[PDB]
Amino acid sequence: KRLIEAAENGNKDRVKDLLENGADVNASDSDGKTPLHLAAENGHAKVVLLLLEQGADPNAKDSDGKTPLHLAAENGHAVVVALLLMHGADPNAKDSDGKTPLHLAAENGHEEVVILLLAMGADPNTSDSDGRTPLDLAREHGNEEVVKVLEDHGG
Amino acid sequence: GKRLIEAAENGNKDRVKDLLENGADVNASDSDGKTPLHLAAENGHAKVVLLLLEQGADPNAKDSDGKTPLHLAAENGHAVVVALLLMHGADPNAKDSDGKTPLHLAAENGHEEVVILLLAMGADPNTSDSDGRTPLDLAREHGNEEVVKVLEDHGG
Known part of the structure; x- marks a missing residue:
């Protein structure tokens, strides 16, 4: 408490x-x-x-x-x-929106967090409730470094 | 190569x-x-x-x-x-030619986040370098107060 x-x-x-x-x-x-x-x-x-x-x-x-980890x-x-x-x-735990920690880091443009999650076996191709992958969210954010990082890890 | x-x-x-x-x-x-x-x-x-x-x-x-x-x-x-x-x-306890571990080098240069990560992975806060100095002694010498506290809290 x-x-x-x-x-x-x-x-x-x-x-x-x-x-x-x-x-x-x-x-x-x-x-x-x-x-x-x-x-x-x-x-x-x-x-x-x-x-x-x-x-x-x-x-x-x-x-x-x-x-x-999501937070x-x-x-x-x-x-x-x-x-x-x-x-x-x-690193692949899904929240109520089907988002993994990698979906949340990619959505908010946190490159360092994305690198750490991928290093620990986070799946770059997991689909959330809307069928979107962390790569789709990184492209919506616009940080090209995060986009590139995900693409290089088989995204 | x-x-x-x-x-x-x-x-x-x-x-x-x-x-x-x-x-x-x-x-x-x-x-x-x-x-x-x-x-x-x-x-x-x-x-x-x-x-x-x-x-x-x-x-x-x-x-x-x-x-x-x-x-x-x-x-x-x-x-x-x-x-x-x-x-x-x-x-995290590997010693260089000066007997310094990565914890000694991180403490000497005031890198608090690095110190936290090393301690989390079992870096001994009481290892002595070639001069008999610990990471705490080096954190103190270079006026790194934030690092000093972290080391003291981990049994330094």
Whole structure:
């Protein structure tokens, strides 16, 4: 409960003391949001690492089917994405719109995140609910470097 | 091999791919022991780094200074490159000729994101270089306060 708000604002000290007091590393909000979802979304890499080493699930799905990897990828938090991938976050997990972390990174033009996801086996040809691939979204965004990266990985 | 090294240094992914298709050795070395992966990691060419790694480039190949591509990427603060190298098994505790690990080089140059990634992959925060200095001593010496705190929190 308090741990979720402490991970959200990137308050590492308050996160550390709440788990020392016995707070569940995998505690969930009414929206299925865990402390790892919010720290990942907000780009708090140090908090993300502490949560991961304490056993936080990098594949926990919220009510939108989004994992902390979806949220970090969407926001272009490259270091956070790398930390999640290192701890076994699925780069092909689909949200409620059928979008993988790669679809969200490509849509928002996050080249570094796209590279990291592809390196960890993200399928560049996965179709979302509208039948669109991350390449289709990268072309809609217009960043030609992301377009090129996806094309080079068999997109 | 020589053409592959310069192309990897320039970040020319298409020329790198063309040379590998023509039979260029992924692990070709210069007279200084620098491989195409050493130069692509040093110059921060993440896309070239990924292509080289998937084609079998050694992330632990040592140059004449005992530096691996991880040392060079960590020293220059290339976070994405560091993450790519770590994913492919680069040793975060490898020592160069000065006894410095990539963590010593990252801490010396104030590269906080690189330090976080190295620590996450098991880099020992208390390794001593040839002068008996730890990454914390080097982070302190060069006034890198953000790096100092991170190292202290990881048992430094």
